[PDB]
Amino acid sequence: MYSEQGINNTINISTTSLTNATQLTVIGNNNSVYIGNNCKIVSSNIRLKGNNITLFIADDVEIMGLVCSLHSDCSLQIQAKTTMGNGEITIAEKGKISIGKDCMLAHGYEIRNTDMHPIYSLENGERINHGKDVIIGNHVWLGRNVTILKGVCIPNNVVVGSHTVLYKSFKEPNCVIAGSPAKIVKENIVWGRKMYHSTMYDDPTLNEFYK
Amino acid sequence: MYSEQGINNTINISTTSLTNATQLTVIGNNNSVYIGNNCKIVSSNIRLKGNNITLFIADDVEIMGLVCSLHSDCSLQIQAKTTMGNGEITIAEKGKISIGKDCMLAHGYEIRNTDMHPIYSLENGERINHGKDVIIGNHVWLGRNVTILKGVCIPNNVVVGSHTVLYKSFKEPNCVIAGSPAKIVKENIVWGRKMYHSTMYDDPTLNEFYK
Amino acid sequence: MYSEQGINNTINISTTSLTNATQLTVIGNNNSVYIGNNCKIVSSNIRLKGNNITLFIADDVEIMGLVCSLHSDCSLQIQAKTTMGNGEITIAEKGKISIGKDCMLAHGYEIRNTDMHPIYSLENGERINHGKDVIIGNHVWLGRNVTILKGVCIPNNVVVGSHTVLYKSFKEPNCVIAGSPAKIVKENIVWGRKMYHSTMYDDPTLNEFY
Secondary structure (H helix, E strand, O other): OOOOOOOOOOOEEOOOOOOOOEEEEEEEEEEEEOOOOEEEEEEEEEEEEEEEEEEEOOOOOEEEEEEEEEOOOOOOEOOOEEEEOOOEEEEEOOOOEEEEOOOOEEEEEEEOOOOOEEEEOOOEEEEEEOOOOOEEEOOOEEOOOOOOOOOOOOOOOOEEOOOOOOOOOOOOOEEEEEOOOOOEEOEEEEEEOOOOOOOOOHHHHHHHHHH | EEEEOOOEEEEEOOOOEOOOOEEEEEEEOEEEEOOOOOOOOEOOOOEEEEOOOOOOOOOOEEEEEEEEEEEEEOOOEEEEOOOOOEEEEEEOOOEEEOOOOOOOOOOEEEEEEEOOOOOOEOOOOOOOOOOOEEHHHEEEEEOOOEOOOOEEEEOOOOOOOOOOOOOOOOOOOOOOEEEOOOEEEEEEEEEEOOOOOOOOOHHHHHHHHHH | OEEEOOOOOOEEEEOEOOOOEEEEEEEEEOOEEEEEOOOEEEEEEEEEEOOOOOEOOOOOOOOEOOEEOOOOEEEEEEEEOOOOEEEEEEEEEOOEEEEEEOEEEEOEEEEOOOOOOOOOOOOOOEEEOOOOEEEOOOEEOOOOEEEEOOOEEEEEEOOEEEHHHHHHHHOOOOOEEEOOOEEEOOOOOOEEOOOOOOEHHHHEEEEEEE
């Protein structure tokens, strides 16, 4: 499991959550890790290197096979009830990525606020791919092998179709987004976890989205 | 190799077939598994959970690293001489997936008849993403990392270009399908297995496709 | 470094190069492998199976988790200072692939000169998909999960956007290529390795590009 090299690191992993086969490494200082009850954070590899990094995983989060790299002054926030399969999250350039509550992220997700390397214009020598924060709203379903790139904001209750690559933000909630270039392909929907709930009304979790 | 609980489950695996490192699990009633002669089903993980499930794999089929999950009243059918590398096939909502004769599936395929999770309309709360059968015709070649989703029928003698996602059926045979979105990019062709042949006429297996 | 079986194979790997966790397998005759100075080739699996194959890796190349398959009469050449993460290179049909200087290849690349199986036109029965050499120019950055197919030539100082598949060659240098089909999406650029420079003028390696 754990491996630290530094001082004033705060690691509070709630007592009920499980972290089987997970490696957590914190190199650096004034960092904080927080995992709530009753999380399942399994077969993952999480690296914090730097200072003043924040990793916050709320209650009731299940993650399996996450590779996570966090650099100095970055923060990853994952809200309650979010489930995640295999995937990768990279944060750099002192940015932030937030993932709202009750998300379902299917295997193969790649999420990042950065390209990790600079691209400059020959026209004026300036950098033009500065990193940008990623906001993934509440009740977002990412299908298989979805890629969410820097600065993309995803509204609440959105489904992203399998193998879709997102470069830009969308504003409309309750919609499905797929294709290349990524596009709204269906409007006025709500997804759920259980095919055994036959209408949206039979899923206690959904009441809010049709209010 | 296999574990099986329940009633009137029939498991017929020819003694001339190899199943090295494959796990087959059958839990339920009235399920049927057939694997024919001179097959090589290796390093695979195959699960049937439910009632009245049918798995049928014909002669001379070679599969390597298939992960396959079938739920009750579901069926998978793979006809003779088809070859498959690593990949995933998933069937739910009591549907069916068919793979025809002499198909060639490269490493990384994802095939399914279901989204695994419901999407409902905000207008009337009804489910709008019900599962739908998948039919992959005879002599279909799927390039690397191809995804075949619900409802998709693929005609005979078709090549699907690597990393292509199919959301919809096609009707034209003898073509190459590729891109995003998936479109016919070459017409009037026939594919074969062996690069050493000079022409299609040199490959007896191809007679039926050009007459 | 080697599990070398056959006749008249030459393997010259500089004593200053690290090969930790790497399987190099050479099965066949008259194959030659050159790896230059100060390379780091680790956790890779490089198989030369066949005869008369050449692998040439120049100085200061760094490779982590390459799965490489070469067949008879094929050639792979990787020029100085190139870096590669996990990925796959497949060469067949007696063809070649060449990667230029100071390229940066991110996790998930797939580079091939061959479809590995024939496609014939019904008009005349002839094969229409013969393998074709791949050329990646100098100072090309392949983003994550990029696929480069047969016959593709990439010009100097190009960035390929993540998840893009190239079926065709480009001619314009200094550009970003993305989408499907692959298109030039931004012209007149230059990329660098380290993002601690407000402008390109603080990267000495970039001077040759303006």
